Amino acid sequence: MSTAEFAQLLENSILSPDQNIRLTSETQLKKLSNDNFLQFAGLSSQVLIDENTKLEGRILAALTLKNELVSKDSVKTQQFAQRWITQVSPEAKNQIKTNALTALVSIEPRIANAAAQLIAAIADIELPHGAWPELMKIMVDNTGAEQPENVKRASLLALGYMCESADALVSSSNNILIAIVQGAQSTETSKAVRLAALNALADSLIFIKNNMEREGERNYLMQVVCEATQAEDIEVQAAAFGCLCKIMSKYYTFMKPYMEQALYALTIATMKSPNDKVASMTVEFWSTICEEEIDIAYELAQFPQSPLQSYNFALSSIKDVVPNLLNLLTRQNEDPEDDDWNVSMSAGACLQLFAQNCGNHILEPVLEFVEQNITADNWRNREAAVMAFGSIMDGPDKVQRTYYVHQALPSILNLMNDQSLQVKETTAWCIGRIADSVAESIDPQQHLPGVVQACLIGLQDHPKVATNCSWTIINLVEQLAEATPSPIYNFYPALVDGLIGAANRIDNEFNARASAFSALTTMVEYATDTVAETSASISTFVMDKLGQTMSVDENQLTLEDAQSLQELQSNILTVLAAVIRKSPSSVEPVADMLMGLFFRLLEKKDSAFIEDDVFYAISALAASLGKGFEKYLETFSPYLLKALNQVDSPVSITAVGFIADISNSLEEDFRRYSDAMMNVLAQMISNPNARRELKPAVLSVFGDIASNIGADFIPYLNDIMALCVAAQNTKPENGTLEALDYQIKVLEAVLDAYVGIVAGLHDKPEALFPYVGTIFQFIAQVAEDPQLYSEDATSRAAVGLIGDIAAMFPDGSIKQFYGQDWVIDYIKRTRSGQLFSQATKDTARWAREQQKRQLSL
Amino acid sequence: VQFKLVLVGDGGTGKTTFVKRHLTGEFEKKYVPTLGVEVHPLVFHTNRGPIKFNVWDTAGQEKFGGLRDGYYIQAQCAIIMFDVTSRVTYKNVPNWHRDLVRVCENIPIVLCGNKVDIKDRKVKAKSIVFHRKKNLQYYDISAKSNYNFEKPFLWLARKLIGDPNLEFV
Ligand SMILES: Nc1nc2c(ncn2[C@@H]2O[C@H](COP(=O)(O)OP(=O)(O)OP(=O)(O)O)[C@@H](O)[C@H]2O)c(=O)[nH]1
Ligand SMILES: [Mg+2]
């Protein structure tokens, strides 16, 4: 194959506007890789350095050869390693390598970058076997100061990648570290080279551990990275802080001296910087510090002997750092609806970490700030204050938080009347941070009313504000209703009323509508009898609303308009599902409404988005109505089969569940729908796409059906006996946790099936007769395996089968089973000790007596 | 005015679902692994005329990687998606970011935590800290409930066009 023809495939793979060309070209490249890897590799290396090929094709040449050399999968990596070693001729190896090194020094940086990636990939394969010994010297020599900017840059880059994926390299580590750090020191190297070095150091941090664990090398390295923080170039600073963060994460242990001697002072200074990017960089450093100190606290709690110890950098710095962080909270975006992440948001995150890490020690500086800005001229100050307060609602102990919440709440609640949108937005959030973390700090008689009033104001305000109030109401209802004398219900009508107002918003701008529906869902989740009239107002509202959305089907408006509508119908269904899973009392009277609406929903096109939700909702409604659901079963049947057949989806499992319930609520009348269900159920389990969870669900539902359906199950009896005989002889997939607990789940579901079958066929012994041996064989496994027999319920079932089966064959047709030793011995084990409850022992008595009659026939 | 957008993330996180919805309004229920990449143009009719994202919907499964980071060539922006229901899909976010920026030097990237409609999140807002470390934009998203449906594209369009006041409606 020509190098030019190969180059055209590569260009076509990503540059062709024709999708069929792209697919074809990628396919042709792939088979060339499989059939003649030697040639593929070689040609790839040539297009890389081919001046006639477009950038994209040359870059792609390097990357895809690399993707045939190294891999995320650990078996593929060994396969690829071996292929390169055995299939590529020594002549081609040198040819490829030489091309890569040339490409690495290209004046076009994106080519050198890709060449850097390919070089690293080849080094992963060859360096562990002491091959490509020339490489280190090349790589280090390209880092020489006299070398041109590009040659140094891509080489440092290549060194980075090389170390990062690494498995000479080790004995060359000093030379690497020096070469990397060299390229970053000296103010007067190129920005790009200095950048490339700092990033190469980052990628290499784990692989230079032994270097980092030497005062000499570590100090040098740390000198350079610290200097780089004080670069005039912003990106170089960002790279430097980037390394500092990683170093703090990786090598916290060694950081105290550098903190004490330099970093402590450098990072206080830069935290003040009037440039937001700079202050951001350094805030992150301190967040990292807090994160690693917080994780240390967890680690000591679970390993109190650990030789690791916190240096308390945060704690020691609160006097300097926290005030400077609080100062950065007043650098918000003027534009109330910017939402772009900035240094103030970074500062807030860092303060929360400071709270969580220093606990109570955070209180003094923050409360001094809050009290002093909570009613200041500037909105920025007012907002920073309520921000600050909410940021410390997690970390300090319950006593402190309660005390200061109690003290500051009147001022906070009062800020809902502010002219500033940002202040109100953050104020509403602050309320929810109080609720979510210290609900019992809000006395029901003297605080909770002021809170509710603040939320109801905010639901009528700008949508950004109303969104937060909804989430805050959710928090309130969650952390309050868990207290036995819950005072929230006293306010349910006021809250449900204001929430509906928000749910009736013209649109869902800034999620104010979707928020409100989520709140309504929660209000319903935590409803009690006391609040039925208001819980009923919810279902009445959303049913009306759902019907309303259905008036105009989607294929009338723009895509955009349809998706906004479908979001609203999804929002409504969340509430409607929760109402049915709590108080069907308020929708049983309009059962036809819901079903009417649900059937309409499932009728129309483009329903796939709600189908499962509606199915889940119907199921739960059906559970309530019991026999009351039969009048729908007809028209619901298509959708039930639709759901059962989706064996890869969880919806099939609740479909199995739905059958369990209607088979049990109806009984002998299920016979009318029995066959169509079973024709599907008998297939499901042997479908190559069936989930794991499906099998035991189905195995057990055969039990349900058989017991309710009786003689009508017989046509399917043999087919089901095959399925749970194969199942009972199935060993664990491996030896792990789930392996056996699933296998037991299967075995318990086989037991459900036989129990249900024996129950169902009480009147029809002739039909069961051929399977007595099969069942007694399963009972042998129960008697054998402790995971089965030691479970009280499983044994009582097993030993109950022994008895019930005997009661069906009073002519000695099966008496040969009752004379076996294991059976006499199994009945005996079940009447012994405590393990087995009284109910089990009394069933074992029944089985013992039935078994004695068999022998005396 | 058009831009190449590469969409990446662990398999089954909802990348194709997200895109197909934006494309046609259809919510795909079945999970069918993407084979290499599906390229589809998305147009948004903004207040400053139409903007077009040529979306490269890449495969998440190693088996079906295709050209893999070969698809990032010339990408002008990206979406990293993870599944909020699956801790491992967030654990791999840093890898997706790395493999991106090694090919696309300096581009705007949005991080999306999909499936927020599902009841019990396994990756709460507390754990989501990567946007913060690498100055990216993060959104909770749900390709099913259409939560923040248009946000990732709105943010990218603004940064790409360089106009903070760009609107979709
Ligand atoms: N509940 C819920 N399910 C979702 C959501 N988004 C996607 N899904 C489902 O998740 C599954 C994954 O869909 P895909 O889009 O094919 O996943 P993918 O990321 O494209 O996978 P790959 O092509 O292998 O990378 C599908 O079954 C979707 O129906 C969501 O927001 N909520
Ligand atoms: Mg896909």
Side-chain angles (χ1 to χ4, degrees):
Chain A
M1 200 201 232
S2 177
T3 284
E5 292 169 343
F6 188 81
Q8 202 77 24
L9 292 172
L10 284 168
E11 288 192 0
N12 281 349
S13 304
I14 49 178
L15 294 162
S16 190
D18 182 317
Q19 51 165 56
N20 308 304
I21 301 300
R22 291 199 315 263
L23 182 50
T24 306
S25 309
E26 186 176 341
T27 318
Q28 173 69 304
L29 284 169
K30 193 61 167 175
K31 86 168 286 185
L32 218 177
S33 197
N34 302 311
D35 305 341
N36 193 355
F37 185 72
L38 174 70
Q39 199 204 40
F40 178 84
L43 293 163
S44 302
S45 89
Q46 286 170 25
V47 178
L48 174 59
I49 55 174
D50 190 70
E51 300 284 333
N52 285 321
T53 309
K54 287 160 159 294
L55 245 186
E56 291 87 328
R58 299 174 66 194
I59 294 174
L60 186 62
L63 297 177
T64 92
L65 170 54
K66 175 213 76 177
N67 295 328
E68 298 288 323
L69 287 170
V70 78
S71 170
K72 293 180 179 175
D73 188 283
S74 60
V75 178
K76 285 258 196 80
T77 292
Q78 293 168 344
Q79 300 192 107
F80 287 5
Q82 194 255 236
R83 174 169 69 174
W84 168 265
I85 284 152
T86 59
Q87 312 311 294
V88 180
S89 73
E91 301 85 279
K93 284 196 170 86
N94 197 253
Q95 269 297 352
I96 288 162
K97 291 177 176 185
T98 295
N99 290 342
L101 294 156
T102 304
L104 182 67
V105 303
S106 165
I107 68 167
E108 185 69 53
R110 311 215 281 117
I111 284 158
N113 292 159
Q117 296 187 77
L118 172 48
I119 291 179
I122 304 171
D124 292 335
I125 294 173
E126 283 199 4
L127 296 187
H129 299 78
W132 213 359
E134 311 94 35
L135 184 60
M136 284 313 98
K137 203 276 199 288
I138 310 272
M139 289 301 98
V140 167
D141 274 20
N142 294 357
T143 292
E146 77 290 12
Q147 298 290 350
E149 178 197 299
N150 59 305
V151 166
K152 295 188 290 197
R153 190 195 62 72
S155 291
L156 293 164
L157 218 224
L159 280 175
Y161 299 163
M162 233 168 285
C163 295
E164 192 251 67
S165 55
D167 294 334
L169 231 189
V170 71
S171 70
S172 203
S173 61
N174 295 37
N175 287 11
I176 309 316
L177 195 280
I178 308 325
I180 311 249
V181 177
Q182 257 197 33
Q185 76 169 355
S186 187
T187 298
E188 64 172 37
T189 88
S190 168
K191 176 196 172 159
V193 177
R194 226 188 168 193
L195 211 74
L198 293 165
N199 301 331
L201 186 49
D203 292 338
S204 304
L205 275 180
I206 291 155
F207 315 86
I208 62 164
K209 24 52 178 54
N210 286 313
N211 304 272
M212 273 287 297
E213 301 164 350
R214 274 199 213 85
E215 212 185 342
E217 274 143 90
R218 180 173 64 255
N219 282 349
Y220 172 57
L221 184 162
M222 286 275 84
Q223 236 295 140
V224 173
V225 176
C226 282
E227 283 290 312
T229 66
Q230 313 299 309
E232 272 296 318
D233 188 287
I234 199 74
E235 289 185 71
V236 169
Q237 287 188 301
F241 275 107
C243 284
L244 279 185
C245 286
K246 273 205 77 175
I247 283 148
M248 180 58 67
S249 308
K250 303 276 75 42
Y251 303 98
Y252 183 88
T253 160
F254 299 99
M255 289 304 99
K256 188 172 172 171
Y258 310 111
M259 290 300 293
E260 291 178 339
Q261 297 176 69
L263 280 168
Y264 192 115
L266 293 182
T267 62
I268 297 302
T270 54
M271 195 176 295
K272 307 210 190 84
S273 167
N275 188 354
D276 295 19
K277 268 285 193 310
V278 163
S280 281
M281 281 172 227
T282 129
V283 173
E284 220 56 36
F285 176 76
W286 278 99
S287 293
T288 316
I289 283 183
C290 287
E291 285 169 340
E292 286 268 318
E293 281 175 359
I294 284 164
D295 290 18
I296 287 172
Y298 268 78
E299 206 166 308
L300 294 182
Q302 212 156 82
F303 288 92
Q305 261 55 61
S306 175
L308 179 63
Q309 168 168 162
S310 164
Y311 295 124
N312 310 307
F313 292 131
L315 215 195
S316 289
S317 312
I318 294 171
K319 213 47 47 58
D320 296 300
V321 175
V322 172
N324 295 319
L325 278 168
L326 297 163
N327 188 80
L328 300 179
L329 297 176
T330 57
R331 293 198 189 184
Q332 312 93 321
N333 306 310
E334 273 290 335
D335 184 311
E337 56 188 63
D338 194 336
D339 110 332
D340 273 13
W341 186 273
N342 64 298
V343 65
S344 73
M345 288 191 247
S346 222
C350 186
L351 190 59
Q352 288 168 32
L353 286 165
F354 251 91
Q356 290 170 305
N357 186 20
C358 302
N360 291 357
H361 290 88
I362 204 67
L363 294 160
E364 164 161 29
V366 173
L367 295 162
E368 220 162 44
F369 176 97
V370 169
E371 188 178 7
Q372 194 153 285
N373 291 296
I374 194 90
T375 55
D377 328 43
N378 202 167
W379 71 268
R380 291 174 168 281
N381 289 237
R382 287 193 304 274
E383 192 280 341
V386 270
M387 179 65 75
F389 193 80
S391 303
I392 63 164
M393 282 310 101
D394 181 2
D397 72 55
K398 197 191 76 54
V399 170
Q400 292 304 322
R401 285 175 285 158
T402 297
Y403 181 80
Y404 290 108
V405 162
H406 184 282
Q407 205 184 73
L409 195 48
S411 330
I412 294 163
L413 293 169
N414 182 48
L415 286 169
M416 292 303 302
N417 315 325
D418 210 273
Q419 290 307 322
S420 189
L421 168 54
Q422 291 86 301
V423 170
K424 298 188 282 178
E425 181 178 334
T426 299
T427 294
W429 171 83
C430 193
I431 307 278
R433 294 285 282 108
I434 295 161
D436 198 63
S437 296
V438 288
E440 23 69 22
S441 66
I442 314 306
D443 89 72
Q445 293 84 32
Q446 216 157 26
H447 276 149
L448 193 55
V451 169
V452 166
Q453 196 42 41
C455 292
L456 302 185
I457 290 284
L459 288 170
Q460 293 197 55
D461 210 274
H462 188 287
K464 265 168 149 277
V465 168
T467 290
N468 282 357
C469 297
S470 290
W471 295 117
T472 282
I473 289 159
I474 292 162
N475 289 329
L476 274 185
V477 176
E478 285 182 335
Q479 260 272 70
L480 282 173
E482 60 79 65
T484 309
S486 180
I488 195 63
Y489 302 120
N490 310 339
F491 302 100
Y492 249 57
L495 290 171
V496 169
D497 196 288
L499 280 176
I500 291 176
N504 275 315
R505 187 174 259 88
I506 321 92
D507 53 23
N508 181 42
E509 212 205 348
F510 297 119
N511 285 303
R513 195 164 67 189
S515 302
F517 279 97
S518 293
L520 290 182
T521 307
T522 306
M523 302 294 276
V524 169
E525 304 275 25
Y526 293 72
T528 52
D529 298 346
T530 305
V531 284
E533 184 184 352
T534 162
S535 175
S537 289
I538 290 176
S539 41
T540 291
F541 166 61
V542 298
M543 271 181 286
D544 188 23
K545 200 77 165 181
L546 179 53
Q548 207 162 158
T549 60
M550 280 183 290
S551 290
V552 204
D553 60 40
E554 46 281 303
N555 41 284
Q556 305 284 323
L557 327 314
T558 166
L559 179 95
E560 166 165 21
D561 278 335
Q563 302 308 83
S564 168
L565 184 81
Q566 293 173 358
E567 174 182 44
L568 170 69
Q569 292 176 326
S570 302
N571 297 344
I572 292 167
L573 249 141
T574 294
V575 173
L576 217 53
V579 163
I580 298 159
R581 302 156 169 283
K582 200 81 179 71
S583 69
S585 313
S586 51
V587 288
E588 293 154 339
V590 291
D592 172 42
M593 203 103 70
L594 284 185
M595 295 312 307
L597 298 198
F598 292 155
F599 284 131
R600 279 198 61 206
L601 260 176
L602 292 163
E603 272 173 42
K604 76 182 187 192
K605 310 185 285 286
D606 288 290
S607 61
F609 83 101
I610 29 77
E611 275 175 9
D612 289 10
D613 297 351
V614 177
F615 186 92
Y616 293 126
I618 288 173
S619 288
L621 195 70
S624 293
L625 300 189
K627 276 204 169 67
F629 192 81
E630 185 171 10
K631 67 204 177 195
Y632 306 115
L633 219 177
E634 176 74 348
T635 100
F636 182 59
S637 185
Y639 307 109
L640 181 62
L641 299 168
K642 175 77 148 46
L644 275 166
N645 282 120
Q646 293 168 66
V647 296
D648 61 322
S649 171
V651 74
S652 58
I653 298 161
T654 79
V656 172
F658 166 94
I659 291 166
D661 300 338
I662 44 73
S663 62
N664 291 316
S665 64
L666 322 174
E667 284 230 339
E668 308 132 6
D669 308 325
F670 184 54
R671 291 176 192 195
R672 180 180 303 179
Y673 322 94
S674 141
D675 291 6
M677 298 294 95
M678 280 296 297
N679 295 162
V680 177
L681 287 166
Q683 128 188 71
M684 280 176 71
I685 173 283
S686 298
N687 193 142
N689 306 322
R691 311 227 293 171
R692 271 161 165 68
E693 317 88 58
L694 194 52
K695 186 171 170 176
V698 169
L699 278 175
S700 283
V701 90
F702 297 138
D704 288 291
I705 296 187
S707 73
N708 293 123
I709 290 309
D712 275 354
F713 191 89
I714 291 163
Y716 306 103
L717 174 62
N718 183 275
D719 291 271
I720 270 52
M721 289 296 302
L723 288 165
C724 48
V725 155
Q728 73 190 52
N729 304 328
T730 283
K731 308 296 140 51
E733 328 197 48
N734 42 330
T736 59
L737 17 71
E738 296 165 26
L740 285 78
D741 295 358
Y742 174 80
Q743 197 255 341
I744 269 55
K745 270 187 290 156
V746 165
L747 293 167
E748 288 175 312
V750 167
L751 210 197
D752 287 321
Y754 297 143
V755 168
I757 290 162
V758 165
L761 297 171
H762 194 286
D763 302 331
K764 307 279 140 44
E766 61 282 351
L768 182 70
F769 178 77
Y771 304 107
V772 173
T774 296
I775 296 169
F776 261 90
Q777 196 183 175
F778 175 81
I779 297 169
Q781 299 178 48
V782 180
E784 237 86 322
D785 199 318
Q787 299 140 257
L788 301 171
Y789 72 75
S790 89
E791 265 285 328
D792 188 52
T794 296
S795 271
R796 179 143 101 263
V799 80
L801 289 173
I802 291 172
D804 291 342
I805 291 188
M808 285 176 60
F809 300 96
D811 64 343
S813 298
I814 68 170
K815 79 162 185 284
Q816 78 253 35
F817 293 101
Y818 294 92
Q820 302 193 84
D821 281 320
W822 70 267
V823 182
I824 307 202
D825 288 316
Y826 180 64
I827 292 161
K828 272 169 154 277
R829 297 212 315 283
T830 308
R831 297 183 47 64
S832 301
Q834 230 278 49
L835 312 164
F836 302 119
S837 56
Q838 186 58 27
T840 304
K841 290 180 173 185
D842 276 330
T843 311
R845 190 61 195 178
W846 160 251
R848 178 52 177 170
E849 288 192 52
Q850 291 305 297
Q851 174 252 240
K852 283 278 83 184
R853 290 177 202 185
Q854 288 286 315
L855 302 185
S856 76
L857 286 169
Chain B
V1 170
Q2 59 180 25
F3 299 100
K4 185 184 168 169
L5 185 164
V6 297
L7 174 54
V8 307
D10 281 2
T13 55
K15 300 185 287 300
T16 295
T17 308
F18 188 61
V19 173
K20 294 289 192 62
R21 256 262 221 189
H22 272 86
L23 195 63
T24 72
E26 285 183 346
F27 176 80
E28 190 57 68
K29 291 169 69 184
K30 265 263 287 303
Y31 167 49
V32 186
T34 304
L35 208 48
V37 65
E38 256 185 280
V39 190
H40 293 300
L42 286 183
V43 190
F44 292 101
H45 321 78
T46 81
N47 80 241
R48 290 181 71 100
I51 301 188
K52 179 169 154 195
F53 288 99
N54 287 297
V55 175
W56 289 60
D57 177 15
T58 70
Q61 275 187 260
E62 204 286 320
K63 294 196 201 85
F64 312 122
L67 300 175
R68 302 164 196 283
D69 49 347
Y71 306 126
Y72 313 161
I73 291 171
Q74 287 287 342
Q76 289 149 297
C77 67
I79 293 181
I80 301 179
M81 200 165 291
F82 69 98
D83 182 357
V84 171
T85 271
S86 176
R87 308 125 262 83
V88 74
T89 65
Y90 175 74
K91 207 173 187 173
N92 292 140
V93 158
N95 290 311
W96 294 109
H97 185 82
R98 185 194 64 208
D99 300 354
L100 263 174
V101 305
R102 285 189 179 184
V103 182
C104 317
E105 167 177 296
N106 178 176
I107 65 177
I109 297 169
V110 188
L111 181 59
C112 289
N114 189 32
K115 311 208 189 171
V116 302
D117 58 287
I118 287 169
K119 181 60 182 162
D120 67 318
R121 291 175 70 127
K122 291 292 157 77
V123 187
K124 297 217 178 74
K126 187 181 184 52
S127 300
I128 295 161
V129 299
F130 193 71
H131 61 114
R132 222 194 58 210
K133 297 177 187 311
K134 294 284 168 59
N135 299 326
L136 310 181
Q137 181 67 30
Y138 171 75
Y139 294 110
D140 285 335
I141 234 68
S142 170
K144 190 176 176 198
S145 73
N146 276 8
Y147 191 73
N148 287 337
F149 195 61
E150 294 204 304
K151 292 302 225 314
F153 295 108
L154 187 64
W155 190 87
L156 284 172
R158 287 171 171 185
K159 182 65 178 302
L160 256 359
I161 294 309
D163 181 9
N165 300 135
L166 189 53
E167 284 281 292
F168 275 17
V169 55

